[PDB]
Design a protein around this nucleic acid. Structure first.
Length: 489
DNA sequence: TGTCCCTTTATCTCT
DNA sequence: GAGAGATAAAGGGAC
């Protein structure tokens, strides 16, 4: 009955493509791959209840919840617990989705429910801090561990609640927490690290192995390799962790002696998530990129030194000719696009969309490069392609303004939020569009605009002190953080 | 056969 | 630009 079971499964997928979820093939694939057949079936059985009152989940939220080991249990649990978490604990549905959307989401949900009161009332955490702790695989473990260990970590060890939250808020947060508890004294007292440096190391995924590996290799990397404790700390706390540290141990001589890299640029390469992969890839590709592509070593190092640098390097090697000779991009432009986290996605997206953006939207190659040369470049490019025409027709923006909003980290968010909040800002708050554009055209433009609309609607006397124009100027180069900075004085 | 937890790597967003 | 936070995905081990 394998063929009938298969027919049943495909009928289920087909039905999900209809109401109420209207899932696309990508979404189906996501749930299948990450949550399995049981998650696909669970979504199908509960589609009405997940999208209906009292949950009202969007299809994207349903997809995010299902797309994990135990996805079925998470979906089941969200149906039981969301009304209490929202109405009793004061969480928003999106915060609930965030707690739910990990392997073991059911456990983290039951645990936020049980623990949020003690964490906030007795330990002094905010609900947002509790959400951040919960929103990872093993969230239950981290929540219980913070609850158990925050008092010892703060009083006996001197850490702030914020620092404990930082350590706890990664996958394996429990491991990281216990390892800080164990290893904070040695690393400070014996190695002379500050507590903040230890927190900075501990607050990445694999924080525990990173701490243990800093203890293990700090002396040999300094002594036998010539690095400073600072460099070792940067390598350990920049996401590279244990893998990066050990790979620097192995490859530093070869990269310096044979390939001619300074130890500083080797450190720059090691100092991101996937630093091990980046190091190995520079070792492999430095000759080829520097003899048969005329890229300088500086340029290669610059590409390698971001998270997933490996991917960026291989992608540069593959696409540099096509982008230079077919799309008319200069190698410097290709380097600039490559030299961010996710440079691979940005490059591939430029290869795909450059012609479209130049010819259907009239953008010059320089503008396309401008948009592409930030983290999340792919996202920004795709949402300019989507929203350029509507923002010009409906909201009366120029292509320049659209490119400007787009050309920062989070450009996608800033564009979408302009689309969502431009009407009410200008209509109900006699706010000007050039003004809203001004707010949107920085990193954090999104939360800036949102804090603005929050102020105008449910204002806050304390903050209710500046002009619909003074707050504008404030958001315009401090954003949300500036708005909060004033609104606590 | 799934569920839960942890590490590593890749990508995106904000301070 | 750098540091940091956050979301996603893979792959592994334990029951």
């Amino acid at each position: 009955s394998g063929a009938r079971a298969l027919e049943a499964l495909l009928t289920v997928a087909g039905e999900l493509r209809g109401p109420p979820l209207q899932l696309d093939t990508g979404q189906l694939l996501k749930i299948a791959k990450r949550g399995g057949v049981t998650a696909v079936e669970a979504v199908h059985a509960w589609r009405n209840a997940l999208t209906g009152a009292p949950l009202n989940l969007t299809p994207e939220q349903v997809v995010a919840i299902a797309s994990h080991d135990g996805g079925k249990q998470a979906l089941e649990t969200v149906q039981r617990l969301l009304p209490v978490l929202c109405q009793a604990h004061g969480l928003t549905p999106q915060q609930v989705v965030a707690i739910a959307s990990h392997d073991g989401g059911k456990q983290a949900l039951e645990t936020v429910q049980r623990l949020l009161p003690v964490l906030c009332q007795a330990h002094g955490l905010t609900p947002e801090q509790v959400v951040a702790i919960a929103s990872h695989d093993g969230g239950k473990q981290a929540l219980e561990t913070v609850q158990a260990l925050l008092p010892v970590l703060c009083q006996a060890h001197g850490l702030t609640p914020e620092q404990v939250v930082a350590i706890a808020s990664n996958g394996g947060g429990k491991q990281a927490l216990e390892t800080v508890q164990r290893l904070l004294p040695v690393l400070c007292q014996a190695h002379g690290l500050t507590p903040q440096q230890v927190v900075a190391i501990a607050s990445n995924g694999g924080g525990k192995q990173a701490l243990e590996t800093v203890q293990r290799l700090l002396p040999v990397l300094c002594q036998a390799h010539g690095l400073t404790p600072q460099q070792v700390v940067a390598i350990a706390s920049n996401g590279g962790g244990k893998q990066a540290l050990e790979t620097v141990q192995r490859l530093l001589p070869v990269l310096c002696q044979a390939h001619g890299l300074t130890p500083q640029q080797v450190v720059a390469i090691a100092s991101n998530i996937g630093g091990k992969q980046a190091l190995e890839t520079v070792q492999r590709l430095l000759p080829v990129l520097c003899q048969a592509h005329g890229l300088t070593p500086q340029q290669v190092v610059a590409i390698a030194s971001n998270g997933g640098g490996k991917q960026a390097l291989e992608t540069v090697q593959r696409l540099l000719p096509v982008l230079c000779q077919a799309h008319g991009l200069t190698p410097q432009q290709v380097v600039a696009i490559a030299s961010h986290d996710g440079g691979k996605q940005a490059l591939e997206t430029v290869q795909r969309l450059l012609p479209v953006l130049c010819q259907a939207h009239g953008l010059t190659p320089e503008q396309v490069v401008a948009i592409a040369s930030n983290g999340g470049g792919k996202q920004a490019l795709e949402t300019v392609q989507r929203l350029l025409p509507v923002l010009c027709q409906a909201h009366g923006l120029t292509p320049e303004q659209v490119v400007a909003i787009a050309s920062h980290d989070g450009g996608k968010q800033a564009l979408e939020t302009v689309q969502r909040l431009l009407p009410v800002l200008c209509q109900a708050h006699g706010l000007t569009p050039q003004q809203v554009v001004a707010i949107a055209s920085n990193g954090g433009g999104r939360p800036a605009l949102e804090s603005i609309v929050a102020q105008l609607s449910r204002p806050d006397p304390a903050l209710a002190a500046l002009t619909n124009d003074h707050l504008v100027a404030l958001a315009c180069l401090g954003g949300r953080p500036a708005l909060d900075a004033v609104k606590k004085l």
